[PDB]
Enzyme design. Structure first.
Site, PDB file in Angstrom:
ATOM      1  N   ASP A 170      44.205  37.876  32.244  1.00 55.02           N
ATOM      2  CA  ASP A 170      43.755  38.410  31.032  1.00 55.02           C
ATOM      3  C   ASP A 170      44.609  38.292  29.852  1.00 55.02           C
ATOM      4  O   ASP A 170      44.744  39.189  28.832  1.00 55.02           O
ATOM      5  CB  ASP A 170      43.972  39.952  31.336  1.00 55.02           C
ATOM      6  CG  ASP A 170      42.938  40.186  32.318  1.00 55.02           C
ATOM      7  OD1 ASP A 170      41.892  40.007  32.303  1.00 55.02           O
ATOM      8  OD2 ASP A 170      43.377  41.016  33.408  1.00 55.02           O
TER       9      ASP A 170
ATOM     10  N   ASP B 113      34.699  38.536  35.490  1.00 56.36           N
ATOM     11  CA  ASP B 113      34.967  39.958  35.606  1.00 56.36           C
ATOM     12  C   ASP B 113      34.337  40.626  34.370  1.00 56.36           C
ATOM     13  O   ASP B 113      35.212  40.758  33.393  1.00 56.36           O
ATOM     14  CB  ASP B 113      36.388  40.533  35.789  1.00 56.36           C
ATOM     15  CG  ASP B 113      36.560  41.823  35.810  1.00 56.36           C
ATOM     16  OD1 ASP B 113      35.337  42.702  36.092  1.00 56.36           O
ATOM     17  OD2 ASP B 113      37.493  42.540  36.008  1.00 56.36           O
TER      18      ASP B 113
ATOM     19  N   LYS C 287      32.111  43.255  34.404  1.00 58.71           N
ATOM     20  CA  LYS C 287      31.634  44.629  34.667  1.00 58.71           C
ATOM     21  C   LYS C 287      30.276  44.809  34.076  1.00 58.71           C
ATOM     22  O   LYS C 287      30.062  45.943  33.349  1.00 58.71           O
ATOM     23  CB  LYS C 287      32.604  45.524  34.347  1.00 58.71           C
ATOM     24  CG  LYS C 287      33.853  45.337  35.002  1.00 58.71           C
ATOM     25  CD  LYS C 287      34.828  46.280  34.622  1.00 58.71           C
ATOM     26  CE  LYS C 287      36.162  46.164  35.550  1.00 58.71           C
ATOM     27  NZ  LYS C 287      36.838  44.858  35.404  1.00 58.71           N
TER      28      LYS C 287
ATOM     29  N   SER D 247      39.991  51.564  39.530  1.00 54.45           N
ATOM     30  CA  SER D 247      41.415  52.079  40.139  1.00 54.45           C
ATOM     31  C   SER D 247      42.255  52.808  38.943  1.00 54.45           C
ATOM     32  O   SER D 247      43.283  53.382  39.381  1.00 54.45           O
ATOM     33  CB  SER D 247      42.446  50.825  40.300  1.00 54.45           C
ATOM     34  OG  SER D 247      42.491  50.087  38.771  1.00 54.45           O
TER      35      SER D 247
ATOM     36  N   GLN E 122      49.658  48.946  38.228  1.00 54.46           N
ATOM     37  CA  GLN E 122      48.953  50.165  38.330  1.00 54.46           C
ATOM     38  C   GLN E 122      49.610  50.952  39.497  1.00 54.46           C
ATOM     39  O   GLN E 122      49.287  52.133  39.676  1.00 54.46           O
ATOM     40  CB  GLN E 122      47.602  49.931  38.432  1.00 54.46           C
ATOM     41  CG  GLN E 122      46.882  49.198  37.193  1.00 54.46           C
ATOM     42  CD  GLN E 122      45.339  49.227  37.425  1.00 54.46           C
ATOM     43  OE1 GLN E 122      44.891  50.194  37.790  1.00 54.46           O
ATOM     44  NE2 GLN E 122      44.803  48.100  37.166  1.00 54.46           N
TER      45      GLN E 122
ATOM     46  N   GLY F  37      49.451  49.914  42.881  1.00 53.00           N
ATOM     47  CA  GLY F  37      49.120  50.011  44.254  1.00 53.00           C
ATOM     48  C   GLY F  37      50.183  48.932  45.020  1.00 53.00           C
ATOM     49  O   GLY F  37      50.872  48.308  44.269  1.00 53.00           O
TER      50      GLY F  37
HETATM   51  O1  LIG Z   1      39.034  49.331  39.166  1.00 48.99           O
HETATM   52  C1  LIG Z   1      39.275  48.176  38.479  1.00 48.99           C
HETATM   53  C2  LIG Z   1      38.401  47.164  38.267  1.00 48.99           C
HETATM   54  C3  LIG Z   1      38.965  46.058  37.663  1.00 48.99           C
HETATM   55  O2  LIG Z   1      38.422  44.902  37.893  1.00 48.99           O
HETATM   56  N1  LIG Z   1      40.416  45.755  37.226  1.00 48.99           N
HETATM   57  C4  LIG Z   1      40.801  44.549  36.453  1.00 48.99           C
HETATM   58  O3  LIG Z   1      41.603  43.862  37.464  1.00 48.99           O
HETATM   59  C5  LIG Z   1      42.867  43.692  36.634  1.00 48.99           C
HETATM   60  C6  LIG Z   1      44.117  44.419  37.165  1.00 48.99           C
HETATM   61  O4  LIG Z   1      45.103  43.807  36.524  1.00 48.99           O
HETATM   62  P1  LIG Z   1      46.921  44.342  36.312  1.00 48.99           P
HETATM   63  O5  LIG Z   1      47.204  43.600  37.978  1.00 48.99           O
HETATM   64  O6  LIG Z   1      46.995  45.653  36.463  1.00 48.99           O
HETATM   65  O7  LIG Z   1      47.635  43.655  35.210  1.00 48.99           O
HETATM   66  C7  LIG Z   1      42.341  43.806  35.158  1.00 48.99           C
HETATM   67  O8  LIG Z   1      41.765  42.521  34.698  1.00 48.99           O
HETATM   68  C8  LIG Z   1      41.394  44.605  35.035  1.00 48.99           C
HETATM   69  O9  LIG Z   1      40.507  44.604  34.087  1.00 48.99           O
HETATM   70  C9  LIG Z   1      40.915  47.055  37.382  1.00 48.99           C
HETATM   71  O10 LIG Z   1      42.326  47.143  36.948  1.00 48.99           O
HETATM   72  N2  LIG Z   1      40.581  48.287  38.022  1.00 48.99           N
END
Ligand SMILES: O=C1CC(=O)N([C@@H]2O[C@H](COP(=O)(O)O)[C@@H](O)[C@H]2O)C(=O)N1
Ligand SMILES: O=C1CC(=O)N([C@@H]2O[C@H](COP(=O)(O)O)[C@@H](O)[C@H]2O)C(=O)N1
Lengths: 218, 217
Positions: free
Chosen positions: A13, A63, A65, A120, A178, A180
């Site tokens: 991203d 991605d 969506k 998420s 996030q 996880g």
């Molecule tokens: O529920 C979801 C769906 C999704 O695609 N994503 C995508 O997954 C990636 C998560 O990135 P990151 O590891 O949090 O930086 C990003 O490109 C989000 O747009 C998400 O975070 N949550």
């Protein structure tokens, strides 16, 4: 199902072509599957998919969506696959006809659709969570084989896995930045999606290697 | 927002030449164009600036933004950098995702349009049941621009009731999807029209005809 190296998918991203290419190239030996979304595509164009294919031996998951009416969804999928994407991620909340439109294009174009069930982030609890199980069941009824579920809610990810069955392919974002956990998430998901924990690290390669080391037994 | 003839063109043609030609043919009837992913993913984000240079029209980026807050922020920044005056965002993903868009819009002097209920049949499965709550969420967040279905005037009326007369409401579904321009304008400030115009044998005549039918409005 696609063979995702190290069960790790890079969420690229970064919005700068030079930085996106540098980071992806640095972790190339650890990941052969890259998720490219709108942050990068709207900043550098759909040709960025072509450049990644040319520079790296990586599968590309767009991605986007997809969340429009059937007619518009069809056009989005066609343009995306025409650009070289191996698969596209579609929202299930807009309904069965909208998902079917994407599946039809993927079928005729020889590509794949990933169905996003529950998300998420915190806001997902407001409307998406309550419809998630049904969205997943809808996907199964429609013949969807690839799904996306949240790393931030292992309990929910577990239920999603049950609904779609062991044969379905499940990828999960939310590990790292996030909150996880990679290991726990991989108890249910086939692969984890990781963005910031890797691309914002001082040494993306070391970050990716570290994540892989923590799940080596998996 | 002052939309000429209460008519917004949904330019979903996927060829730059055709998109520019057709928009030019109906330019005297509109001053607001909705550009979505069909055109942007086929010709690039630079198409937005091209429209502003050729028509000086207002541009609404219909990107159905529906990601997590962090990604939504990036999508909005890239979109406004391209010259879009407004962006359409889904409300289903929750308040935090909408707020992320509102923040970037405020920072760059743009507007956010909140999509509550959609116009297609599938909208009845999950979106419709959450639509009223999504609209109330918009009110709580200070949202002033909304999108509702031309195909369900009773639902569009309910949305108008929730957001009030001061809020701005635009509505897709008129024409090809079965909605009626005049009836839709009883509740929406402006109607979005795509295929009925851009797929018509004579786009200009099609636009003129629609406007003639709502002349008293
Ligand atoms: O529920 C979801 C769906 C999704 O695609 N994503 C995508 O997954 C990636 C998560 O990135 P990151 O590891 O949090 O930086 C990003 O490109 C989000 O747009 C998400 O975070 N949550
Ligand atoms: O509920 C909705 C939202 C929306 O933006 N749209 C969009 O509005 C346009 C409608 O075009 P058309 O007049 O049916 O050809 C398309 O660009 C759609 O993607 C819709 O049709 N329904």
């Amino acid at each position: 199902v696609m063979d995702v190296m190290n069960r790790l998918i890079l969420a690229m991203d970064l919005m700068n072509r030079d930085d996106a290419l540098r980071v992806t190239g640095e972790v190339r030996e650890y990941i052969d599957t890259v998720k490219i979304g709108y942050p990068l595509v709207l900043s550098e164009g759909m040709d960025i998919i072509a450049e990644f294919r040319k520079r790296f031996g990586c599968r590309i998951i767009a991605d986007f969506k997809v969340a429009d009416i059937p007619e518009t969804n069809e056009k989005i999928c066609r343009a995306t696959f025409k650009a070289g994407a191996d698969a596209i991620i579609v929202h299930g909340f807009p309904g069965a006809d909208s998902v079917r439109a994407c599946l039809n294009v993927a079928e005729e174009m020889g590509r794949e659709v990933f169905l996003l069930t529950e998300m998420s982030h915190p806001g997902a609890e407001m409307f998406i969570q309550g419809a998630a199980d049904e969205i997943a069941r809808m996907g199964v009824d429609l013949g969807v084989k690839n799904y996306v579920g949240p790393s931030t809610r292992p309990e929910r990810l577990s239920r999603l896995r049950e609904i779609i069955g062991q044969d379905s392919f499940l990828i999960s974002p939310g590990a790292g930045a996030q909150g996880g956990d990679p290991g726990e998430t991989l108890r249910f998901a086939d692969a984890i999606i990781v963005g910031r924990s890797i691309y914002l690290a001082d040494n993306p390669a070391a970050a990716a290697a570290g994540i892989i080391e923590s799940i080596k037994d998996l």
